[PDB]
Amino acid sequence: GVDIRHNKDRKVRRKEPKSQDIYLRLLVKLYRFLARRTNSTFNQVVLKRLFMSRTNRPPLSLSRMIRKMKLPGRENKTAVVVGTVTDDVRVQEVPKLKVCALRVTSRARSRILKAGGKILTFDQLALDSPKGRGTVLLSGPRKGREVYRHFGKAPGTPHSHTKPYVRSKGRKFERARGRRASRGYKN
Amino acid sequence: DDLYGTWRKAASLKSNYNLPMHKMLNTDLSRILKSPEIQRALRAPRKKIHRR
Amino acid sequence: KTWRRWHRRVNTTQKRYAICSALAASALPALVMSKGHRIEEVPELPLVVEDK
Amino acid sequence: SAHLQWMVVRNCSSFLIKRNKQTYSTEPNNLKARNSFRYNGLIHRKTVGVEPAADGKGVVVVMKRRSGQRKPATSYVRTTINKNARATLSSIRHMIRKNKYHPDLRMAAIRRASAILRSQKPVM
Amino acid sequence: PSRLRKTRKLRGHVSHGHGRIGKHRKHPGGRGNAGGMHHHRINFDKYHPGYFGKVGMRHYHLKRNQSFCPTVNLDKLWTLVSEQTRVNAAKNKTGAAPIIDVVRSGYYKVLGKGKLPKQPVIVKAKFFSRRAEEKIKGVGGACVLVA
RNA sequence: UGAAAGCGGGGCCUCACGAUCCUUCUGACCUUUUGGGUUUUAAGCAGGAGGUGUCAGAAAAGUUACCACAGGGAUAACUGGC
RNA sequence: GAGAAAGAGAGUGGCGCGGACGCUACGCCGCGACGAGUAGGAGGGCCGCUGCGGUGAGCCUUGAAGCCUAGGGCGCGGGCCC
RNA sequence: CUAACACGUGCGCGAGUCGGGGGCUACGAAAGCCGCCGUGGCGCAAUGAAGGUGAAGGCCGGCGGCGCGCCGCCGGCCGAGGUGGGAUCCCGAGGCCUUCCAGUCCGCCGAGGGCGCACCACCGGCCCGUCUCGCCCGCCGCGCCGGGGAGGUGGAGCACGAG
RNA sequence: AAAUACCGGCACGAGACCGAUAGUCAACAAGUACCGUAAGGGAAAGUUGAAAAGAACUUUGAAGAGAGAGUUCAAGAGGGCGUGAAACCGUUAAGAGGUAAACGGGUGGGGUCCGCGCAGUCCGCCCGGAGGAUUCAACCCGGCGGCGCGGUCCGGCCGUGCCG
Numbered sequence A: 001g002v003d004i005r006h007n008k009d010r011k012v013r014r015k016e017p018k019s020q021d022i023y024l025r026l027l028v029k030l031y032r033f034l035a036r037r038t039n040s041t042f043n044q045v046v047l048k049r050l051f052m053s054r055t056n057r058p059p060l061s062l063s064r065m066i067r068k069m070k071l072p073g074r075e076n077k078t079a080v081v082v083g084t085v086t087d088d089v090r091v092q093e094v095p096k097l098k099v100c101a102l103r104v105t106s107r108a109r110s111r112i113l114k115a116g117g118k119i120l121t122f123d124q125l126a127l128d129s130p131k132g133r134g135t136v137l138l139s140g141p142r143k144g145r146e147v148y149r150h151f152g153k154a155p156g157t158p159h160s161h162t163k164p165y166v167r168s169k170g171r172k173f174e175r176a177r178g179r180r181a182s183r184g185y186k187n
Numbered sequence B: 001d002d003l004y005g006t007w008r009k010a011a012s013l014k015s016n017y018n019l020p021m022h023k024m025l026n027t028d029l030s031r032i033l034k035s036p037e038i039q040r041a042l043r044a045p046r047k048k049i050h051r052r
Numbered sequence C: 001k002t003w004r005r006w007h008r009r010v011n012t013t014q015k016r017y018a019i020c021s022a023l024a025a026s027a028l029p030a031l032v033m034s035k036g037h038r039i040e041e042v043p044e045l046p047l048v049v050e051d052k
Numbered sequence D: 001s002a003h004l005q006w007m008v009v010r011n012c013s014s015f016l017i018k019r020n021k022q023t024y025s026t027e028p029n030n031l032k033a034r035n036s037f038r039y040n041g042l043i044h045r046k047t048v049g050v051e052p053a054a055d056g057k058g059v060v061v062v063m064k065r066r067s068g069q070r071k072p073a074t075s076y077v078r079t080t081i082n083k084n085a086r087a088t089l090s091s092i093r094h095m096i097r098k099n100k101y102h103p104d105l106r107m108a109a110i111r112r113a114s115a116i117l118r119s120q121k122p123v124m
Numbered sequence E: 001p002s003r004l005r006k007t008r009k010l011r012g013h014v015s016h017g018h019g020r021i022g023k024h025r026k027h028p029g030g031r032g033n034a035g036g037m038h039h040h041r042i043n044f045d046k047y048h049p050g051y052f053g054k055v056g057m058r059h060y061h062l063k064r065n066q067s068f069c070p071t072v073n074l075d076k077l078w079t080l081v082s083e084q085t086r087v088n089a090a091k092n093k094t095g096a097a098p099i100i101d102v103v104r105s106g107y108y109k110v111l112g113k114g115k116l117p118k119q120p121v122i123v124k125a126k127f128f129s130r131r132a133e134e135k136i137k138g139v140g141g142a143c144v145l146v147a
Numbered sequence F: 001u002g003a004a005a006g007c008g009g010g011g012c013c014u015c016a017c018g019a020u021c022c023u024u025c026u027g028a029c030c031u032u033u034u035g036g037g038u039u040u041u042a043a044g045c046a047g048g049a050g051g052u053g054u055c056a057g058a059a060a061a062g063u064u065a066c067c068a069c070a071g072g073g074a075u076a077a078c079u080g081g082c
Numbered sequence G: 001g002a003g004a005a006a007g008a009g010a011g012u013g014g015c016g017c018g019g020a021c022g023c024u025a026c027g028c029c030g031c032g033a034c035g036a037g038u039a040g041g042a043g044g045g046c047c048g049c050u051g052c053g054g055u056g057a058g059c060c061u062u063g064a065a066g067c068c069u070a071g072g073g074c075g076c077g078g079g080c081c082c
Numbered sequence H: 001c002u003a004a005c006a007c008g009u010g011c012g013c014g015a016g017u018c019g020g021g022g023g024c025u026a027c028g029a030a031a032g033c034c035g036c037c038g039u040g041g042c043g044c045a046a047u048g049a050a051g052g053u054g055a056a057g058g059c060c061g062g063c064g065g066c067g068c069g070c071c072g073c074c075g076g077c078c079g080a081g082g083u084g085g086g087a088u089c090c091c092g093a094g095g096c097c098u099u100c101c102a103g104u105c106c107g108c109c110g111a112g113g114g115c116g117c118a119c120c121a122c123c124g125g126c127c128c129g130u131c132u133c134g135c136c137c138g139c140c141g142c143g144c145c146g147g148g149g150a151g152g153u154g155g156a157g158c159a160c161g162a163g
Numbered sequence I: 001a002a003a004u005a006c007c008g009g010c011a012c013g014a015g016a017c018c019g020a021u022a023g024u025c026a027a028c029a030a031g032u033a034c035c036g037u038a039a040g041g042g043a044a045a046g047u048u049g050a051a052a053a054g055a056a057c058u059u060u061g062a063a064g065a066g067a068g069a070g071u072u073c074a075a076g077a078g079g080g081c082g083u084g085a086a087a088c089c090g091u092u093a094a095g096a097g098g099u100a101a102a103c104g105g106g107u108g109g110g111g112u113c114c115g116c117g118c119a120g121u122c123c124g125c126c127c128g129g130a131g132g133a134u135u136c137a138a139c140c141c142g143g144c145g146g147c148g149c150g151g152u153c154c155g156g157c158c159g160u161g162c163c164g
């Protein structure tokens, strides 16, 4: 007999992507090699972010791309997301960028290549910098989805600003007893 | 190429279509792994089996 | 019942992705023989014949 | 390329057969006849195949050239070796080694040619 | 696909994933949304506050077409008109401001959220925010009304 | 109120009390009353009260030996047990 | 595999034609610790049935499906092959 | 099994997205196509019962307004928060020997120091309702008109998309 | 009038449907047989074989039913007859038997079949002994293929490259 519990004995991570497309799995076959035979911890983060889900790879937009590139120090540096560099239309000027992503929106490709930057993908990033030397890794807003507004401390409860699941927003749809001091009680 | 477009000419016989871009371009993984750009920046391959 | 959901609707862009992939894989020699067509005496398998 | 069409062929090919917890592959230019990446003959640019001859005796050796990849009729060149068992194997060894032609299959082709010639010398 | 579903793994298990003590009975809590104020009050007040009661004025023959007034923000104001107009506005030394009819794009009201780039405009709309029209004045440009 | 420091938004402290819907009263030179305007009226918004003592709140008399059904040894009328 | 952060680094000046296996990378290999289980949850099935699109130049009157068996067997097992 | 909803996953596109209704041209009642068929749905904006309103600012020069050294209005400029933690990266005091010294290039290690992703916590800021305090501005109608600020407070908000 | 609806009727076609306890109640002399006074309730039930070639004739018995003979590829398809499982039963063979039978672990004994057991593996390299070949290496001619990359040979084609 051994006095240990087995509740968390199985760690819960991914070790392969749940996707079944072959180009992503060739990227995985490349970065498995580049993560265990380099001492760069960039390749482990790229390998771990290739496994992740669509909701764990949120799209990073172009006006946040350029904004996080306009910080000092990180000039003429390539810059890497693992998700999708979408266009942002509420920005007019666009500097030249060295972007490296899995899939870039066609309008964002036109926007970047018009400004004169270049768009690598990951098999080109491996040839350009195997240890990831001189990169800026970025990621989209992971709490950007609307389902992280329904989460947390429940409504009908003091100091909990949670959007409740309501079938149609109006004045008749959950405004009346929990929501008012006049009728019932306020939270 | 008139129907399904080209990589820079769009689809003439559809309305607004263009071929979907690749997720990686150089696909031949053997030449990427056997390349002097990468083979320089690797540690030593330890392959001595150390049994019990 | 008869009102089982018999049909499925697919997005137009990935309906087009699918036939682009089918056409593009019908040009590789390994992906046709593995499909099974005995082909080994064909002159070139992206095979264009006279318009006549 | 090669690694995409391997990941297409690897579970979906008509040459693959799977029974009795054993996996095989029946493409004509396969050495050791097993489903793997090194041995599959339809995929690569350069490929060695060993077949018994159209005659009852002799070993034909199949070499995939580099130019007509998409051209299947003018891609594979045949050479027939109807000789003694030692010089047949030295011929196949010189063709694979000294031409730098896909050197991982250098011993598997010699094993296969040695297994063909044993079947061609008469039954006990 | 029933081949992938749960019931293919629950053959042989004599309760089929619903328990031996509490059997899978038919309707143990009432049908539907039953018992709002009686025995599911804890759920309807921990998770749907405001669900019971009346509030506000009853408006009988409401028509969603009288109150049609869609909005657009100033940071996507220039996305209405093609890029050549604003490029030529940046290149023009005359001071000729481009004219942008938001109603032609399909937005009646202009609200002002974002930074608006510094070149003039004639923005014509059906309504305006206070901050939107003064952002248009701050870039220097006119707010034309239209009915 | 005390001169003042201060004390006091009920009872020295521990109990003395009540949701939605509905009604009534109070409030603002308030909102709506639907094509426009005026005036009544009604609807609203905010704050009390009318009360659910089964007190998180159905509106509610019996009898069956003519009885019925689904169940319960979760539960009495026998023995047996302690 | 070596107790000690890092180059089996480049540069300038004083005969015999030979070398096993491998790597379905979803693959293969190496160490360590562990294995109870009802209600329940999840994973893997090259476990099984019926039909459909592909495929095996599949099988079959020189005898398919079914059924029987003191025959030979494999798999922890569902089952399966002779 | 049908429908609705929720979340997790895979796929296409992406501030958009979708033809499902209609139409045009054996298998095929399929498949393709429309784009001045995006009507429409969902999303890109919230808040209020409602009339409604509807999501940064900062600096300079001039003109007890004086017993806004604080701007009413204009000309110019910077421009879209901060603090802590933060995977990644960037810089590099020194050093990784072959006989020793000077000595370049490539790679690597590293004291210390940065620019800090996502996210979390906190402080700010903006929009809508409400309350309090208070002064100033606008004109085609100078009115029971309209606009504005400061300080709390109610919101399923904004704060460089994520559907 | 048109666009619209149609589990009834006439005439069609089709099916990722069911395959005789399924699919209509009904694959058949089915709303038939049968039950009820009545309103109404309402089944079970497919398959010899390629072709009846459906067993002439002999013999026992009164006959059903046999024994021979014959048809057929087959009666191990004989008029409710393809296949013919299970429970249950008859008989033969083997084995056993006083704690009802049955079961798990462990062997032992007897069977039944299989190994086509019953003088036991081959495979490379070297040495020796006897052999037999139209015989190797090097050269010459022809064909085919691969690439220190011809540092930089000539000519093409392409760029999800640029410029004029």
Ligand SMILES: [Mg+2]
Residues within 6 Å of the ligand: A001, A002
């Ligand atoms: Mg143990």
Ligand SMILES: [Mg+2]
Residues within 6 Å of the ligand: A006
């Ligand atoms: Mg356990």
Ligand SMILES: [Mg+2]
Residues within 6 Å of the ligand: A006, A007, A008, A009, A010
């Ligand atoms: Mg666990």
Ligand SMILES: [Mg+2]
Residues within 6 Å of the ligand: E013
């Ligand atoms: Mg269980």
Ligand SMILES: [Mg+2]
Residues within 6 Å of the ligand: E017, E018
């Ligand atoms: Mg359950």
Ligand SMILES: [Mg+2]
Residues within 6 Å of the ligand: E020
């Ligand atoms: Mg039970």
Ligand SMILES: [Mg+2]
Residues within 6 Å of the ligand: E022, E023, E028
């Ligand atoms: Mg229950």
Ligand SMILES: [Mg+2]
Residues within 6 Å of the ligand: E021, E022
């Ligand atoms: Mg219970």
Ligand SMILES: [Mg+2]
Residues within 6 Å of the ligand: E024, E025, E026
């Ligand atoms: Mg239930």
Ligand SMILES: [Mg+2]
Residues within 6 Å of the ligand: E038
């Ligand atoms: Mg109650």
Ligand SMILES: [Mg+2]
Residues within 6 Å of the ligand: none
């Ligand atoms: Mg006070």
Ligand SMILES: [Mg+2]
Residues within 6 Å of the ligand: none
């Ligand atoms: Mg009137």
Ligand SMILES: [Mg+2]
Residues within 6 Å of the ligand: F065
């Ligand atoms: Mg009585």
Ligand SMILES: [Mg+2]
Residues within 6 Å of the ligand: none
């Ligand atoms: Mg009873």
Ligand SMILES: [Mg+2]
Residues within 6 Å of the ligand: F079
């Ligand atoms: Mg008693």
Ligand SMILES: [Mg+2]
Residues within 6 Å of the ligand: none
């Ligand atoms: Mg267990």
